[PDB]
Amino acid sequence: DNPADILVIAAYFLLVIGVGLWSMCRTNRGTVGGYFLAGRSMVWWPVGASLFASNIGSGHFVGLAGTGAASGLAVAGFEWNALFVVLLLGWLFAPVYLTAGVITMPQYLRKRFGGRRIRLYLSVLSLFLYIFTKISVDMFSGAVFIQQALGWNIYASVIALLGITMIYTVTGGLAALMYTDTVQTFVILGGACILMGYAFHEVGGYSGLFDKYLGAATSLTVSEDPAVGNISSFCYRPRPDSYHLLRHPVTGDLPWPALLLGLTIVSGWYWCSDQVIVQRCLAGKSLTHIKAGCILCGYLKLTPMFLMVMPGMISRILYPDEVACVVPEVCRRVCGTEVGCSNIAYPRLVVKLMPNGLRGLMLAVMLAALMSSLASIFNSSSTLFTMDIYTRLRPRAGDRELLLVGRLWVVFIVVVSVAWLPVVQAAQGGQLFDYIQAVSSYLAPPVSAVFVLALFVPRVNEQGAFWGLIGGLLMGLARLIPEFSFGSGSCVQPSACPAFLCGVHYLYFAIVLFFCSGLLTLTVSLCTAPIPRKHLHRLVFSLRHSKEELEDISEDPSWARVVNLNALLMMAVAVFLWGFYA
Amino acid sequence: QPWMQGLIAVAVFLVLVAIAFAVNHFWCQ
Ligand SMILES: CCOc1ccc(Cc2cc([C@@H]3O[C@H](CO)[C@@H](O)[C@H](O)[C@H]3O)ccc2Cl)cc1
Ligand SMILES: *[C@@H]1O[C@H](CO)[C@@H](O)[C@H](O)[C@H]1NC(C)=O
Ligand code: NA
Numbered sequence: 001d002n003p004a005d006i007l008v009i010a011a012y013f014l015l016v017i018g019v020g021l022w023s024m025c026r027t028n029r030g031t032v033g034g035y036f037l038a039g040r041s042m043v044w045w046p047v048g049a050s051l052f053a054s055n056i057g058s059g060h061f062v063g064l065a066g067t068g069a070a071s072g073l074a075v076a077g078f079e080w081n082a083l084f085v086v087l088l089l090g091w092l093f094a095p096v097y098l099t100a101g102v103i104t105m106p107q108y109l110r111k112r113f114g115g116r117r118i119r120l121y122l123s124v125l126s127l128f129l130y131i132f133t134k135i136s137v138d139m140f141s142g143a144v145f146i147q148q149a150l151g152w153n154i155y156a157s158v159i160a161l162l163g164i165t166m167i168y169t170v171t172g173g174l175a176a177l178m179y180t181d182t183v184q185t186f187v188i189l190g191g192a193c194i195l196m197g198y199a200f201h202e203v204g205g206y207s208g209l210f211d212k213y214l215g216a217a218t219s220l221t222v223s224e225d226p227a228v229g230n231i232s233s234f235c236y237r238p239r240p241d242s243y244h245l246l247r248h249p250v251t252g253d254l255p256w257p258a259l260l261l262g263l264t265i266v267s268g269w270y271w272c273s274d275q276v277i278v279q280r281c282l283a284g285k286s287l288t289h290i291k292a293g294c295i296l297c298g299y300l301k302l303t304p305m306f307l308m309v310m311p312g313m314i315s316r317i318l319y320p321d322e323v324a325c326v327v328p329e330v331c332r333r334v335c336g337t338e339v340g341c342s343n344i345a346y347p348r349l350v351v352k353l354m355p356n357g358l359r360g361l362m363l364a365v366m367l368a369a370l371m372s373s374l375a376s377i378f379n380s381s382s383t384l385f386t387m388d389i390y391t392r393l394r395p396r397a398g399d400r401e402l403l404l405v406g407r408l409w410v411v412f413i414v415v416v417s418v419a420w421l422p423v424v425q426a427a428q429g430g431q432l433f434d435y436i437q438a439v440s441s442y443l444a445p446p447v448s449a450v451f452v453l454a455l456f457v458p459r460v461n462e463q464g465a466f467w468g469l470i471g472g473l474l475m476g477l478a479r480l481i482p483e484f485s486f487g488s489g490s491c492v493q494p495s496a497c498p499a500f501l502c503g504v505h506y507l508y509f510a511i512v513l514f515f516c517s518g519l520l521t522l523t524v525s526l527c528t529a530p531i532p533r534k535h536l537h538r539l540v541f542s543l544r545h546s547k548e549e550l551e552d553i554s555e556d557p558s559w560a561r562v563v564n565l566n567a568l569l570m571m572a573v574a575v576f577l578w579g580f581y582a
Numbered sequence: 583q584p585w586m587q588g589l590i591a592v593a594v595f596l597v598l599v600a601i602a603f604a605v606n607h608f609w610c611q
Contacts, residue, residue, distance in 0.1 A: 568599060575591045579589070
């Protein structure tokens with residue numbers, strides 16, 4: 001309501017309109033190549049910024065700060081894992097997808113194994129994963145930030161946000177989104193940095209976070225409800241391993257072997273096997289631009305710890321009676337949610353710390369984060385649907401009808417997401433961030449397992465890859481459905497789940513499901529006919545000519561040398577930071 | 583001390599990258 005907020009939001013919209021118009025003036029959007037792969041003309045800095053901005057949504061501010069507040073700094077693991085896995089994308093996966101000439105990752109599996117059915121299955125599974133794990137987290141976190149910061153109707157505002165991101169997605173294509181994602185990356189990091197600075201000032205520096213956070217307990221630990229009573233000291237006191245990334249392998253909330261192996265498997269899917277991230281690399285101009293873009297993305301993926309997780313922890317120190325509430329009736333008064341108020345952590349800092357002008361910048365940050373992620377998911381889902389499913393229904397389609405169908409899918413997936421909003425709003429507190437990582441850990445590892453065996457074991461055939469995926473889905477669902485039946489509850493009100501389902505961490509299940517999908521893929525492969533695949537195997541990883549029988553992934557040796565040394569430097573910095581906070 | 587945990591992690595990583603260059607130099611050529 002202060003003019004300065006409306007001017008900052010208007011200036012942000014003018015930047016987004018302006019970079020969109022410059023991209024539409026520059027690029028061709030009349031062809032499938034142009035609209036869905038940005039002409040394969042994207043240099044390193046939009047690749048990197050777009051990888052970053054398609055990944056960081058409103059969920060990363062709400063979820064990571066909230067989990068920061070609840071549980072300390074090991075959720076940085078979620079972000080920091082990405083660093084190493086984006087080097088797998090640029091050096092292992094992206095070369096193979098460039099030499100295969102794929103528009104989609106289901107098409108790569110069409111090329112590698114050859115049936116009609118793996119491509120259809122992986123398209124449809126991806127489309128469901130985007131609704132369950134990607135749209136849900138964005139819509140949920142948007143609605144938390146609006147409820148808490150603005151106070152507006154959380155239906156009308158999410159309809160309105162979805163409608164502007166629909167227009168923003170359909171009006172340009174992947175080329176406008178990737179250039180606009182350089183501006184969205186700038187706004188996100190810059191506003192997030194200014195709020196991090198105000199937050200760290202309020203607790204009295206970096207030292208202030210680490211000497212006040214283990215003390216940061218609420219004074220309201222006794223419920224008026226009988227059979228809740230005096231709340232346990234485990235449920236309101238901050239965890240004694242709060243300052244440690246690497247937590248106990250059995251009793252850790254995020255066990256270190258689950259963090260390292262289990263997230264590598266799930267991140268593998270997310271970064272290396274999944275249309276949303278990989279479409280930005282498929283739009284790379286060169287392999288060396290994809291590799292440089294991958295390093296930019298890894299450096300930016302270090303930034304979430306300091307911009308989101310540590311502000312969340314500062315939110316627990318400054319507002320311990322509101323952010324670290326445990327009494328079910330106090331948490332209903334604070335944030336509407338009986339199970340906790342950890343999700344207010346980030347929006348509380350914005351409300352309570354930002355002046356008249358910079359509140360508007362923090363609305364622009366959350367808008368930028370939410371629009372970039374939703375636009376990426378809508379465009380990628382459009383590509384997946386158009387190219388995979390609609391060319392099953394209409395093979396002699398042509399590049400004018402396929403763009404119409406691409407833009408109409410964005411309208412349909414917006415409508416599905418509006419109809420999905422009440423179901424996601426039924427997730428109560430910071431449970432949803434666990435649900436989305438649990439879903440990803442139950443559904444993604446079969447897909448990670450097939451892409452690894454698609455790229456590194458040329459004997460894996462179609463029967464193995466398909467029945468690996470389906471067996472994997474069956475094993476996934478055998479956990480998922482039992483779990484979602486029993487609920488989650490909370491530390492105060494435990495769920496009544498057996499400890500032979502929910503007892504094992506979902507990132508440990510991700511490990512088991514990966515090796516079991518993989519073992520079944522190899523077993524069924526070895527017990528069927530070896531399919532010489534044309535004889536071309538530019539669909540596989542090798543050092544020796546990456547091929548067999550434009551599509552030439554040879555880069556300049558000087559620029560090769562540069563990105564190869566910056567990847568090792570970027571890993572060394574990562575491993576230092578893993579060492580530092582372990 | 584955090585700084586020393588960081589350095590020991592980096593040290594071990596530079597040993598593993600030296601091992602990677604050793605194994606591919608003698609076993610791919
Ligand atoms: C412990 C539960 O609490 C959490 C956990 C994770 C988050 C952040 C977050 C991370 C991912 C991405 O997750 C991928 C793996 O699923 C990573 O490969 C990627 O690097 C992340 O970017 C997606 C959505 C969200 Cl909200 C917040 C709270
Ligand atoms: C809570 O603990 C106090 C002692 O610390 C005791 O007097 C009281 O009875 C307890 N209340 C309940 C509901 O168990
Ligand atoms: Na985003």
